[PDB]
Amino acid sequence: KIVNIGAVLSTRKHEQMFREAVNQANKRHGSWKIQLNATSVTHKPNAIQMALSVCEDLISSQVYAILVSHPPTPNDHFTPTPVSYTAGFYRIPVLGLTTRMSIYSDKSIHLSFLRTVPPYSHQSSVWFEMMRVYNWNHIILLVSDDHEGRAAQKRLETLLEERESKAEKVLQFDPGTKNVTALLMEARELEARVIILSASEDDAATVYRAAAMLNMTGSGYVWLVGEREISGNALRYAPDGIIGLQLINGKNESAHISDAVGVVAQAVHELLEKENITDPPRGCVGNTNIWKTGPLFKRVLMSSKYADGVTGRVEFNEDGDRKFANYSIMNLQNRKLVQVGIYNGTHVIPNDRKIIWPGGETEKPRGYQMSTRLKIVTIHQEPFVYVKPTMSDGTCKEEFTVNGDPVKKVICTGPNDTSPGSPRHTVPQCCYGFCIDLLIKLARTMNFTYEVHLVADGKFGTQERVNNSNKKEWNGMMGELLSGQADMIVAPLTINNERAQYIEFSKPFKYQGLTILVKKPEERITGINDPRLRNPSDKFIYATVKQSSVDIYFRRQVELSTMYRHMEKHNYESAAEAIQAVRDNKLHAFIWDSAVLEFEASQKCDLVTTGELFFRSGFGIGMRKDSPWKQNVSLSILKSHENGFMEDLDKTWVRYQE
Amino acid sequence: LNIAVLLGHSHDVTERELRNLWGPEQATGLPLDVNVVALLMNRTDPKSLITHVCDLMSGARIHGLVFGDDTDQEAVAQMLDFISSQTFIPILGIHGGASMIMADKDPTSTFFQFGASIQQQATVMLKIMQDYDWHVFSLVTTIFPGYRDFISFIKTTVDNSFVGWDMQNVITLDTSFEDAKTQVQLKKIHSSVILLYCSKDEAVLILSEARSLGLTGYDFFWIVPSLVSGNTELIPKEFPSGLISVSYDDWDYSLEARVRDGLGILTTAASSMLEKFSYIPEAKASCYGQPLHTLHQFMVNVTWDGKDLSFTEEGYQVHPRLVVIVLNKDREWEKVGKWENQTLSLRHAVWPRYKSFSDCEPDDNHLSIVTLEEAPFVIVEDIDPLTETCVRNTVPCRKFVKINNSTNEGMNVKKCCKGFCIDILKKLSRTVKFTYDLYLVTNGKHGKKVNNVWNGMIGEVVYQRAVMAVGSLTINEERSEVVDFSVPFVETGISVMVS
Amino acid sequence: PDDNHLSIVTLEEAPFVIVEDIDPLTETCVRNTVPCRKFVKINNSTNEGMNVKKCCKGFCIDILKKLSRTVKFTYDLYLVTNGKHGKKVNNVWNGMIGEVVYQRAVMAVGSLTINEERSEVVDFSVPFVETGISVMVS
């Protein structure tokens, strides 16, 4: 009638209070003849003998749930892995009470492991609530470790899915190094100022000393750490005015001992409500039969709903952790951790303690520098971006239009040719035209300055395979945007599905489709509906620019695979190469957007376009992810649509026939 | 050095061959003080595991442990990894639960398994699905972990594919199912091939549910990994006869050859590290009373007897022996496919039906269809040699081409078909909802009664090797005598071409 | 806990949303059309009207059907009786904008022009047809 319950703890008065609470729970939960005995196992320096004590003491004792209850371990091993790995052989639910590790948070190695304390991943939940309340948008993930940081970043992205914002700089590297001042300096020249640190104690002390060498204790630095950053000399090396989180009575042991009693005893009484009453056998002589109610009694532990608790209302989630994470918000106020926040799970309640900041005001608003310089990338298309070398050095020719208007140019920075063609000749050149004047109108409308550079290669950018891991990476303008080398693509970006599958866009400024430029008796080809192009030959040479939207659109349509077999024969780099080829009758057809071909038909009388329009798409400003420029720039472009400013831009280069 | 080898009791394995398997072997023995201790153990509990480890590590300082499990408990490999972490002894997983793939090894450990990764095994399963043209599929997983990296690898493989893998989204299970809410998730499946990634008893429950849901049909295929199967000597109940499994428990790669290859890897590492450092035997003293030159950082590229048995950073063989098996009509696992370093060497190009997956299965929809090469109707092209996949607006087919003219040997080269009647066949397959097995005729043209023997498509229908003739075919009186046509769908008489 | 129905309002436009009577031979909307309701009031002073079921077809109806095929959701398509597309009549939007802003309709799948204040009060999707303005003459 007795049932041994395994406890893993040294000091015997905790087991005395455990037996007292278990006897009180058995008194008030029916007149059934069950008894609950308790067995204690203590510290050993050798984990093999720990697992030995667990197997020759608890499994033959028919335990139901073994409790991890060693907080004050002086060794830096921190290994209750004998208990968990021994009880996982029979699918016994191991209850943790001490640590918050991600290796115990993962159900992969520790299968049936539940616990009453939520891990460091719920600090991201608290900080996401801080970003919702105190209006914070961009973060920086500084992880000196490698193991827990991956799960922390995964939970961080899972919680930031509601905003679809990500960190500007995530970091994972090898601990024990002192040369991280380069990474902090690269994080300094960014725009986000909310810094997230999640590492060990000595790693936190090292990065605090490195930030003190780089004097990151100034204004605007939004530091937000956990509890491993306020321990030891990392408490001393922390700047006075740093915000951290602390367990509410987590180090107090008997509180969660009583919470574990209130969970385990009523869970046993809930398991005795239904059928399938199985027991773990005495695992001594070949007793390796699996305990079939492992996931069943685990589900009893998962759906455990209570109201008792010193820390609060105990309830388990769908991940084997503790719901409703509550922590004290501490502040290092003149070498003293001051409890400056008492947290409600839905809203933050600061107390009457003054929050002394290292920077300016007592409040914590958003801290940014409003993106004063924006890198802009484009590509060589003459009716959109005219690119010319400078007059003497840097200055541009003061060109006048047909109405005496001086062309508002810009000093772009571009190469001479590609890397095989040009070894190294990259100079600031003059750039102007259609999208340049559009960018000047956007820079005049909104209050920002900018920076104009050029694309390295001669491609738009497609999702092309790379050598390692057989992964489809990016290139071109998108490859320079996603690498941080650009800030906003202002270019003739043909909007399709795959480019919008990753980044967000704006509303298009130009609406057109696809057409064919030919040379002009029956000298007509007449568009895409020619069966001479459906069934090609060796003299109907049609192709496209390599890695463009034309190749994507003719690669998605598998019924147009035949043209996909032909256009690979004569892919070019720039459209001007295709213009020079079709002018000298090297190309016989060319699929391209309508504006450039109609402009070249206005310039050159021999080049004749067709009229069969297909794939009516839009040219839009290539935008980032969740970013504060998505709405303002779109409203400014729509303001340019509603008036006759697009008509004036047509009168610059587009509308005028020659 | 001193190496302990313990095994199970299955596969008719005695112990005297383990005594004779170390002695006359290892002809190129470079270390001096090498000895082995071969033992056996009925008990597979971790109590006896810790007992034998503390008896053999103190047993004249054994530097290498070789364990072989015969049961189906995946936690035994976790306990062996814990033993390798605590004792710093290189332990090689060989058979059974010791050879099962765990989640994440420790970087400070020396434990290694003789098994493939989940990514390589998913690559093998998608190679099966690509070679057999089963494109539309789904994925059913429980909360048994290791599934997140599996879903991520499937999504990155489909995103990095030229096949165009249509895929209904991954079906997840909440808890131990009441058959109340997970049944709604299972009724979402309308595809043919279902991938299942869960534990053993969960697989038994889900396959019993799919038997109760009728999802064990002729069109409904199930491809499971080695984590579902466990061992080949025990084939449990409620598996459909035709269950595709990918494992490596082969009798050809026998347990004696397993421990011989393990001894070869251990002696190769010890010998090639002996040329770098002298004092190679450096063992732990005892389990009671409380290292730089280690073998863990050395055997990334190790090779014995010409077999590429190199070890990855995550503890896997780089080129193992992946074995693709099916469940036959007599409740046995027949070896079908072996796997090269890059390709998958298959045995049956045409997929064998295994019609009676269970008892009550009326399977009268595998319609064998012959067709004839004509230019406007049945365009017959080669498969793309760069992708090894027909483009998705076409259908697969095969042609029985005789390579040598001397005898009647031939091979079924798989090719692609498109055109007009191919679209008719696809729209019939999407309207009437039947499977079809298409192949070209090899005897010649449409057909003609020669010596009262028909040939061509007429002969393939009359001699009952072809169910219907979808390919282009005229109608006269003798064909309507010997076969039965459908309604005419195109007005095709005779005609005269002139200039 | 599930949610897939979407309260969707539209508006009659002759090349986009054609709303017709149900076929009396079958008492069924023909298969390219979808069912809808219309709050028809026979006469002006009575506020009470009948939600007479009619059939919608056209371009935006095909767009809605293909979105319901791909995204796999359901809907309750209905018509507006407040008036035309949208105009802020003294901080009160009318028509489909008044349906979406006051949250009586989830989204307006039907045909709708896009300008500045409409992009201010609600959010739009990517465009699908090049529809500016034009002038009809002889």
Ligand SMILES: *[C@@H]1O[C@H](CO)[C@@H](O[C@@H]2O[C@H](CO)[C@@H](O)[C@H](O)[C@H]2NC(C)=O)[C@H](O)[C@H]1NC(C)=O
């Ligand atoms: C129930 O708990 C009691 C607590 O005393 C257990 O008694 C101990 O048993 C161990 C193992 O035999 C002895 O080493 C201790 O000396 C015992 N305590 C004393 C001082 O009597 C008892 O074994 C438990 N019941 C079971 C079946 O485990």
Ligand SMILES: *[C@@H]1O[C@H](CO)[C@@H](O)[C@H](O)[C@H]1NC(C)=O
């Ligand atoms: C590395 O450390 C030295 C000394 O602290 C410092 O001077 C140097 O700038 C660091 N190098 C970088 C930039 O990583």
Ligand SMILES: *[C@@H]1O[C@H](CO)[C@@H](O)[C@H](O)[C@H]1NC(C)=O
């Ligand atoms: C520290 O602050 C100074 C400004 O007083 C500035 O040079 C820079 O931010 C830091 N430089 C040093 C000396 O670390």
Ligand SMILES: *[C@@H]1O[C@H](CO)[C@@H](O)[C@H](O)[C@H]1NC(C)=O
């Ligand atoms: C734990 O907390 C309770 C309530 O604050 C307190 O009474 C008790 O003394 C603490 N436990 C210890 C350390 O005894």
Ligand SMILES: *[C@@H]1O[C@H](CO)[C@@H](O)[C@H](O)[C@H]1NC(C)=O
């Ligand atoms: C905050 O703590 C209180 C008291 O310990 C308790 O209500 C609960 O644990 C928390 N509140 C929440 C998150 O609802």
Ligand SMILES: *[C@@H]1O[C@H](CO)[C@@H](O)[C@H](O)[C@H]1NC(C)=O
């Ligand atoms: C947090 O706020 C909610 C508001 O209803 C409440 O349910 C919960 O108990 C609060 N937790 C506490 C007491 O901090």
Ligand SMILES: *[C@@H]1O[C@H](CO)[C@@H](O)[C@H](O)[C@H]1NC(C)=O
């Ligand atoms: C650009 O082109 C060539 C390389 O192709 C380079 O050598 C030369 O200096 C450049 N010429 C101009 C226009 O400056």
Ligand SMILES: *[C@@H]1O[C@H](CO)[C@@H](O)[C@H](O)[C@H]1NC(C)=O
């Ligand atoms: C723009 O910003 C600058 C400060 O950088 C300042 O002139 C003012 O705040 C703004 N000016 C206008 C007119 O928007």
Ligand SMILES: *[C@@H]1O[C@H](CO)[C@@H](O)[C@H](O)[C@H]1NC(C)=O
């Ligand atoms: C892979 O590397 C080869 C050179 O070995 C190169 O020709 C090819 O372009 C690369 N392909 C990918 C997918 O990056």
Ligand SMILES: *[C@@H]1O[C@H](CO)[C@@H](O)[C@H](O)[C@H]1NC(C)=O
């Ligand atoms: C966008 O426009 C509104 C108009 O008042 C302005 O208040 C807001 O600050 C702008 N957003 C940004 C980030 O410039």
Ligand SMILES: *[C@@H]1O[C@H](CO)[C@@H](O)[C@H](O)[C@H]1NC(C)=O
């Ligand atoms: C272990 O020993 C027992 C002794 O009776 C024997 O029956 C059994 O077959 C052995 N192995 C297994 C399968 O437990």
Ligand SMILES: *[C@@H]1O[C@H](CO)[C@@H](O)[C@H](O)[C@H]1NC(C)=O
């Ligand atoms: C094997 O790996 C080692 C590194 O552990 C490397 O130095 C060596 O070059 C490799 N063997 C070959 C292919 O030479």
Ligand SMILES: *[C@@H]1O[C@H](CO)[C@@H](O)[C@H](O)[C@H]1NC(C)=O
């Ligand atoms: C892959 O395969 C062969 C064995 O079939 C192996 O010897 C060699 O390492 C590889 N060769 C090729 C073709 O890459």
Ligand SMILES: *[C@@H]1O[C@H](CO)[C@@H](O)[C@H](O)[C@H]1NC(C)=O
């Ligand atoms: C055909 O026969 C020749 C020998 O005459 C042989 O080399 C070839 O392999 C045979 N074809 C096969 C089996 O592929």
Ligand SMILES: *[C@@H]1O[C@H](CO)[C@@H](O)[C@H](O)[C@H]1NC(C)=O
């Ligand atoms: C018959 O002989 C020729 C000789 O080159 C060769 O193509 C092959 O062996 C056979 N061809 C046929 C008809 O399959």
Ligand SMILES: *[C@@H]1O[C@H](CO)[C@@H](O)[C@H](O)[C@H]1NC(C)=O
């Ligand atoms: C509306 O007016 C018509 C014509 O006078 C009349 O027949 C009808 O009854 C009126 N409907 C009402 C009463 O709402």
